Amino acid sequence: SAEKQISLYDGQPFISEQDVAAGDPNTPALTIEGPDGYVIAVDAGTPIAPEFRDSNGEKLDPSTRVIVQKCDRQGNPLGDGIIFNDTLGRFNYNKMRTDPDYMRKTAKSLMVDEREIVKVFVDVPDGANGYDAERSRFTLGDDTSDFGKAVEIVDHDDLTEGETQAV
């Protein structure tokens, strides 16, 4: 069918990234951005693999925080609509990538039209190591597995509710 089950990560074209310094929560380390004619969707709960390590390949301070956040056009943050306000010092990477219960689901569902941004703001408060991306990764889904969920992509061409989803 037109629906397809996928799982995102860092090394993709439409996604973008950048290094970040300590005490600069307004600098997004990851910028997801709607492609043209490809709507996506996220139900109320889907995994994330928030790997966010140092230059020296070390997860940053546990007091670090991650905030996923929706953004409309204009490169603009938005309050009504936000997912995954959480710390860093919580995930236990090596297991949470696999187990069903160390897994981490979203707050609520989501949709992303052909041009809509999502940002991953990172509050490193202070007294910490700077962030690097090449030593870091990210995900949003587990389509391979059974118990877990995944991202639902659709091509805008094969629909008649496209205008309603555009509203």
């Binding site: 306000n85 160390y102 202070d126």
Partner: protein, 229 residues
């Protein structure tokens, strides 16, 4: 317009001005306060619901231990130690129950073995005469409660009258659905109706030392909430 959010021992939604940290009273045990939560400028209200909402709290203490020419390698602690999730195998505790740091040598101090319920420890290394070391074992044998303030200090009372212990807190493995914590209580507080956690225990607590290696913050408290914007 209700959205879930998370709090911290530091800043976040409060700018480190609508929150404070604090130590406790030790010589007379008192159910003192260590941390508050003032509503900031913006919000209409905040809600906590035990039996629906989560919690995390990683407390550690502090001491100071010298060294000797014929150094001991061995220490005793007046603060009972337990594991966190299972065995006392420091490799796989889900976070250590002890941290150590030499001061002269600005470096870690690794552990060899623990005298488990004896509340004594063996180290891996050999300190030197007059050499200072700072430790950060976890905190057990202490209660905890919540309460509330009516913009002055006139307490409404308390969330849930019965306390909860910290050795138990460590015992329940954090980070596992179902095995998570969900206390009892259901509250709401608007602007300047601050909350304050309370703790009654003999031993001290530590939020910061500026020499603790792992990330500037010796302990933490973290929590989930359901906010009206």
């Amino acid at each position: 317009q209700t959205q879930e959010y998370t709090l911290s021992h530091t800043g976040g939604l409060l700018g480190s001005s609508k929150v404070t940290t604090a130590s406790n009273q030790t010589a007379p045990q008192r159910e003192t306060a260590i941390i508050s939560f003032e509503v900031p400028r913006k919000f209409s209200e905040i809600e906590y619901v035990g039996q629906r909402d989560a919690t995390r709290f990683v407390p550690r203490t502090t001491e100071e231990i010298t060294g000797t020419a014929n150094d001991d390698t061995v220490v005793q602690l007046q603060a009972n130690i337990q594991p966190i999730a299972g065995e006392e195998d420091m490799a796989d505790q889900d976070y250590p129950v002890v941290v150590a740091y030499n001061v002269t040598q600005g470096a870690q101090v690794e552990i060899a073995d623990v005298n488990y319920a004896t509340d004594e420890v063996t180290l891996a290394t050999d300190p030197a005469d007059g050499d200072t070391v700072k430790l950060w074992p976890i905190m057990g044998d202490g209660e905890v409660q919540f309460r509330l303030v009516n913009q002055f200090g006139q307490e409404e009372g308390r969330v849930y009258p019965w306390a909860t212990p910290l050795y138990r807190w460590h015992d329940f493995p954090q980070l596992k659905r179902g095995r998570e914590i969900n206390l009892h209580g259901s509250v709401t507080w608007q602007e300047n109706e601050t909350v304050e956690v309370l703790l009654d225990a003999p031993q001290a607590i530590t939020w910061e030392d500026a020499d603790y290696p792992e990330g500037q913050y010796v302990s933490t408290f973290e929590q989930d909430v359901e906010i009206t914007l």
